[PDB]
Design a protein around this ligand. Structure first.
Ligand SMILES: CNC(=O)[C@@H](C1CCCCC1)N1CCC[C@H]1C(=O)O
Length: 330
């Protein structure tokens, strides 16, 4: 089998991407944030505290003839931005872009943090990291991808995120028309449960390439690119007036600037992030200060190749027995 679904930026800055997902019988379609940095599929639901729901579409298991309570199972998660959610668990039929999984754990939120409530466009998350990170207790559950894997033509999924435009998540096949040149594959460590890999270095604009190992994760659920402070300082030093602001919470730059590109290494190959991709707009409406798309990972504990990096590439998440990651230009 295969699946293919369009993913769409939630706003004009690509702050996140949502993908329609069919849950239950008859189908209930929710727009979920596909997140290769976590491993829970959770949704706003008929069980979510009323004051914490504001415009989201909810999953109502009582209206699904294929829903079953996963008795005694609960879940609780907190993400890197400090947001969180928790609740109980059902199993149900879940389809993405034509690909159907029966008995998928669908985690129903009873509580969500304010950042989720405040975002009316995201109805939940669909985790695509390794199932060892799944938070369901006392019986850990498999991701949608993990459940689908044996039935897929090939045990892979691909992320083709657009810049200020829709993109595509494919399951079970590689669309050779979706990228240019060849795909460079690189080793993955699953030791922390992430799609963790090592970049071979970087360049700023037209500068010389710096060969240096940068360990990080490929995370579709993170908006920006988080790299070591040395790397991030070297980038913003090429932008007149750019500075790190503790009050704002990262590097800002004059909205009048033309941003240089940023290149990262994948083996001997190079992925170029155009300068415009690194612009996340006025820090507040009308401000002449703009927020940068490359930020320091120093206070995170891990480097994160988020959407700013990934949208510059066609990315293959290879879930074979020995997992790997592939990057192509497009
Ligand atoms: C109409 N859907 C349901 O009644 C749900 C049930 C699931 C748990 C509570 C919400 C509704 N199932 C489908 C088969 C019968 C029943 C069950 O699991 O016992």
């Amino acid at each position: 089998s295969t699946g293919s679904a369009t993913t769409t930026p939630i706003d004009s800055l690509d702050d996140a991407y949502i993908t329609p997902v069919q849950i239950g019988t008859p189908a209930q379609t929710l727009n979920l944030d596909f997140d290769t940095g976590s491993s829970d599929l959770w949704v706003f639901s008929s069980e979510t505290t009323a004051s914490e729901v504001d415009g989201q579409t909810i999953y109502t298991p009582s209206k699904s003839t294929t829903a079953k309570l996963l008795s005694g199972a609960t879940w609780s998660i907190s993400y890197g931005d400090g947001s969180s959610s928790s609740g109980d668990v059902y199993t149900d039929t879940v389809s993405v872009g034509g690909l159907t999984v029966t008995g998928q754990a669908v985690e129903s939120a009873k509580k969500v943090s304010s950042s989720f409530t405040e975002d009316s466009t995201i109805d939940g998350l669909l985790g695509l990291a390794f199932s060892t990170l799944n938070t369901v207790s006392p019986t850990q559950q498999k991701t949608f991808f993990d459940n689908a894997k044996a039935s897929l033509d090939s045990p892979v999924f691909t992320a083709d995120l657009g810049y200020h435009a829709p993109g595509t998540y494919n399951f079970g096949f590689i669309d050779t028309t979706a990228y240019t040149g060849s795909i460079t594959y690189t080793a993955v460590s699953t030791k922390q449960g992430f799609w963790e890999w090592t970049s071979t270095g970087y360049a700023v604009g037209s500068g010389t390439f710096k060969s240096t190992s940068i360990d990080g994760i490929a995370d579709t659920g993170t908006t920006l690119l988080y790299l070591p402070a040395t790397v991030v300082s070297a980038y913003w030093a090429q932008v007149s007036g750019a500075k790190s602001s503790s009050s704002v919470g990262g590097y800002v730059f004059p909205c009048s600037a033309t941003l240089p590109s940023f290149t990262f290494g994948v083996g001997s190959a190079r992925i170029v992030i155009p300068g415009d991709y690194i612009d996340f707009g006025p820090i507040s409406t009308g401000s002449s200060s703009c927020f940068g798309g490359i930020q320091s990972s120093a206070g995170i504990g891990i480097n994160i190749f988020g959407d700013v990096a990934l949208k510059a590439a066609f990315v293959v998440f290879n879930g074979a027995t020995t997992p790997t990651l592939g990057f192509a230009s497009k």
